[PDB]
Each structure stands twice: as C-alpha cells, then as structure tokens.
Ligand binder design. Structure first.
Ligand code: NI
Ligand code: NI
Lengths: 187, 187
C-alpha cells in the first residue's frame, strides 16, 4: 500500500513543524560533551537550560526514503564553548544530509572517521551539504536561537557513541570576543 | 577519498543558488504537455515564455547520497491550465523527495503508477513529503513566481517519459476566477 503524500507547515521563525515528534535536550542530557566540566556541572545545578529542541517527521528505515527535521539550537556557552547539538556519524556511514539554515547565526563542525575536521558557517539561507562519512554537529555562535531544517535518508540512522566518547577533534569557543575554531585538548 | 563538505547561499526571494547548474524550460520545450494544443501553439509563437528555471546541485548517482535544487516556476496559463513543471516518476521508483515552498502560491500534483491523484496546496513554509512511487509535478496558481527547494536521493533519477506520453490523471485549471483540479480529458 502506497503511503499518503502530505504537506506540513514549517514556521521559519520558530522552527515548529506541524505534526512532528518533539525531542528536548537539556544540558543535563549532555554529560561528557563539553570541555569545561566545572562550568557544565555548575550550569546544570543552577538552571539546567534546554540546549536544543528537535521537531522530526520520520519514516520507517527504508532505502531511498527521506526524513526531515528542524532544530532550534538555543544560545549559550559552557565556559568558553558555544552551545551545540550532540553530533553524530550516520549508522549507515555513507549517508549524506542537507541542512538549510533558517534563523540566527551558527555553523557546522564536521569530521571524518579519522578526525580531520571542517567548519562551515551558516546564516539564514545557507544550505550545507554533509557528505557521506562525515560526522556533523551544529553550533550556535550568536545571541538568539539558531534554527535550521535538515533532510536525511530514512535509513541513515545514528552513531552518537563515537562522539560521546571522544568528541570532535576541534571545539568552537569565544576568545577575545571572537568565535574561534581550535584544537580539542580532550582530543 | 572523502568528498568536501560545503555551504552555498540560496536566496529565498529569487530562488537563485549561487553557482549552481542552471536549467531553463521554455513553453516550446513542453510540447504535448498541455491539454489545449492550440493555445500552446499560439503562446509559443506570440512569446515562447520561460515556464520554469531550475538551479541544481547534484552528486554522482550513488545510494544514500543527496541532491538539492531550487525551481522558479513562472506564473501563466496555457488556455485555462496553469503553468507547471513537466513532472516525473523517479527511475528508482521507490525514492522519496522533500519539497520546501519558499515563495509564491502553488501546489503539487501527485499520482501513483495506477493513476490515483492527490493535490497538495503549497504556500511559503509548506513542506511536502513526496513518498516512494508517486510521480510529482508542481503548479503555479498565482500571478507571481512560485519558488521552492527540493531535496532528493542522488540515485532517484527521472522517468519523464511516462508523464510525457499520457500526462497526469488530473489537471489544474482556472474556471470563473477559481482554481479547480479536475479530471484530465486526454488521460
Ligand atoms: Ni545526521
Ligand atoms: Ni523528483
């Protein structure tokens, strides 16, 4: 039986998708992700801010099918490091992804299985091509929510563990009022 | 070798992707597509208007990878029928597609291999899920350009021929200033 085509309204200003399933990620949800563990623990104890919310419209995991989701990445810092999504490689490593930036100031940090990293700045209208094999994490580098839409293969899946254990080979921090992409000491 | 991640600017007001492959389809490129052949012939001779332009960013045809393209679908009618894209099934029939409406007023006509049709209205912010097996054609029902972004599997390809020969089971026309989707009499 064929699946039904549908249209859903995406609000470019809030990232809310009609009919999507919501995911809420708080700072407490990201232990071991930020370099400055003291600032993390302190921020989690004081207020445990929401780091990002995701609104996903996903299909069964099937070759050739497509999922899509917006993310609203909140502004903030853990010590010097800007708020980011957990990041992942795809379970089917060779699956690509396309991101479309809708609101705010941010960027994407990507790395290969071997650790070689890339940084792609994102502003409203920027479309980012995430090639096969690249792990990817988005970072909010501004003062307002950073909102984007992502379209990804239905069978791409997720390898979060690799990133949770070793993180990214680079980190994105604020140094002298400037955004800088630098080596991860933890790496 | 790993492919290079990149970002490109997509302009939401003009639909232009900076540096993408540009394709132009004029009314003369769509012979046999509109029901009113005499009206098609007449408009071609009088003006041969551009019906739509496409800006595509494509990868090699490999499983799990992704292409993206904007379309600028110009307003117009051939007889009573609104301007539309040629439309296709995918060569790998079960490949889905995601459309993001950016500007203007239009919609998507879809149909199964067995001819069952569906119409989905699109206004700015509408995201349409084009499931596996459904042929799909966009239509402009307003008086300004209808602009959208499409993300599709790199290996979907196109089967333009089926639609070229017999068309969609439905057409989108204007009757007494109103937009109507009705049975295609040449189907
Ligand atoms: Ni992904
Ligand atoms: Ni298609």
């Amino acid at each position: 039986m064929y699946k039904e085509p549908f249209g859903v309204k995406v609000d470019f200003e809030t990232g809310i998708i009609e009919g999507a399933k919501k995911s809420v990620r708080r700072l407490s949800d990201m232990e071991g992700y930020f370099v400055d563990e003291r600032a993390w623990k302190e921020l989690v104890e004081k207020e445990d801010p929401v780091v990002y919310e995701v609104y996903a419209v996903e299909q069964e995991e099937k070759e050739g099918d497509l999922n899509f989701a917006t993310t609203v990445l909140y502004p903030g810092k853990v010590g010097k490091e800007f708020f980011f999504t957990k990041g992942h490689f795809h379970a089917k490593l060779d699956r690509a992804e396309v991101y479309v930036a809708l609101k705010g100031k941010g960027g994407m940090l990507l790395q290969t299985p071997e650790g070689d990293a890339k940084w792609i700045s994102m502003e409203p209208g920027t479309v980012v091509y995430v090639p096969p094999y690249w792990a990817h994490r988005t970072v909010n580098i501004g003062d307002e929510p950073f909102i984007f839409l992502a379209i990804y293969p239905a069978d791409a899946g997720h390898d979060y563990g690799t990133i949770a254990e070793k993180g990214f080979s680079k980190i994105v921090i604020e140094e002298n009022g400037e955004v800088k992409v630098v080596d991860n000491p933890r790496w």
